[PDB]
């Protein structure tokens, strides 16, 4: 879940971590146009708080989003008041139109539980992409590149609020268990503590490739990517 | 209270905050010798983890400590294995000897509850100081210099452990309420959260002066001091 204070802190936490959604969006837009020169529309699946979408809207005449968390989607709609942002589930949704690109960024795909859900999501992405368009999926880490025991800590301040965030990652079967704690402080607020836990699936490279292929997409992996985890692209046909 | 993990984290937290106990001790030793040129002994009251004492031992032939927290004192004794460190209460203790200096550092005096306890502690300090010696007390903030709403945050790493500490200070009658939260993280540890709360008395400058005078000490205040809170010195007679 991405509800409540988690959702409210998300953008500030990733700004403090230095995530550059503007540069990621410009790179994404150029990648789409590389494959589809007259591309004019984009669907961002698991769009979160709509940071990519806000920048992509400066580049594509139609951008839409899909998000399962109502609290994340509320922030996305406020950020993107002129865009249609849909509530729904990447495993099983139907918008009744296709787009030049279908994107799923920042390892959101790792919230799927196993091969059947991964295959289902990829088939939905293929069902929403145009024939000269592109499906873009930023994976979670592969098992061979996952670092168990990893601790990340950072602090950011904005508007009078100080937020400290610490994460810890461990191996739990075929998933990463990530525990995240926050201290949120301010002159009137005092200090409040928050915590959450995620299980993010460690799909192998071959499992992603299998899901793309079963959806009718030809698949390519590029290492590095916006987060060090690489990027998969898929073209219909 | 200064027990358990609080005590265990104390030195790492103040090292990350940049507290320089070596420089503070050299300054203290020179201040004592300024008043008592043949000074050879020192008692550090509320000595905590014994950081000042460890450096003062390089300068005075006899250093002793007094500390009410068994967990702080355990760390102090490990740091100072050749020194006599006493368990007891600054309000009412009796060592049966006097010292060239009696010191009480880093606002430990603010854990006393009102004028009667402050007067009692100062009388005990005078009862343990030699006639050419000096009593040194680092006060808490005076009401006029206290900053309500203050938030301090910092993170330090050592040995594989990451510690984030956040404090928040507010006014609660004639005391500061300080809330402190910690996140302690490591590759095997995971993340653990700890909290504590202190009530530190906001004695006025005149209240400190009154306690010194009632103990038979002539009192001087020097602003700035090791922590921005100044320093009181008191000479018998
Ligand atoms: C260099 C490196 C890191 N990691 C893992 C270790 C850890 O799991 C993650 C880095 O931690 P954090 O910066 O908190 O990342 P996010 O907020 O993106 O993760 C979340 C994802 C989902 C929900 C919550 C948090 O990458 C690896 O597995 N391999 C690597 O080489
Ligand atoms: C500049 C400034 C600060 N402060 C206050 C505001 C706040 O109360 C304190 C600074 O906070 P922190 O760095 O956490 O200090 P310690 O660990 O020494 O405090 C503890 C004391 C006892 C138990 C726990 C913590 O000084 C003032 O009152 N006036 C000032 O001008
Ligand atoms: N089955 C699902 N369908 C749609 N969104 C999902 C989902 N499972 C998880 N999510 C969403 O996946 C997101 C992961 S955080 C990534 C958000 C965004 N793409 C960004 O780059 O910042 C969350 O917003 C979460 O609610
Ligand atoms: N009545 C009392 N008698 C003795 N020590 C006391 C006390 N009340 C509080 N203390 C001690 O006061 C200390 C405050 S922290 C300061 C410790 C040390 N002087 C330093 O500079 O680091 C704690 O170790 C606490 O246990
Ligand atoms: Cl606030
Ligand atoms: Cl550890």
From Swiss-Prot, chains A, B:
The keyword Kinase does not apply. S-adenosyl-L-methionine binds at residues 2, 10, 21, 46-47, 67, 89-90, 105. It catalyses: dTDP-3-amino-3,6-dideoxy-alpha-D-glucose + 2 S-adenosyl-L-methionine = dTDP-alpha-D-mycaminose + 2 S-adenosyl-L-homocysteine + 2 H(+). One of its GO terms (molecular function) is protein homodimerization activity. Changing residue 111 to A/N: Strongly reduced activity. GO terms for biological process: antibiotic biosynthetic process; methylation. Pfam families: Methyltransf_25. Pathway: Antibiotic biosynthesis; tylosin biosynthesis. It is an enzyme of class 2 (transferase). Its EC number is 2.1.1.235. Keywords: Antibiotic biosynthesis, Methyltransferase, S-adenosyl-L-methionine, Transferase. S-adenosyl-L-methionine-dependent methyltransferase involved in the biosynthesis of mycaminose, an essential structural component of the macrolide antibiotic tylosin. Involved in the last step in mycaminose biosynthesis by mediating dimethylation of the hexose C-3' amino group. Homodimer. His-111 is a strong candicate for an active site that hydrogen bonds to a water molecule which in turn hydrogen bonds to the C-3' amino group. However, it is not conserved in related S.venezuelae DesVI methyltransferase and its mutagenesis does not completely abolish catalytic activity. Belongs to the methyltransferase TylM1/DesVI family. This is dTDP-3-amino-3,6-dideoxy-alpha-D-glucopyranose N,N-dimethyltransferase. It comes from Streptomyces fradiae. The lineage of its organism: Bacteria, Bacillati, Actinomycetota, Actinomycetes, Kitasatosporales.
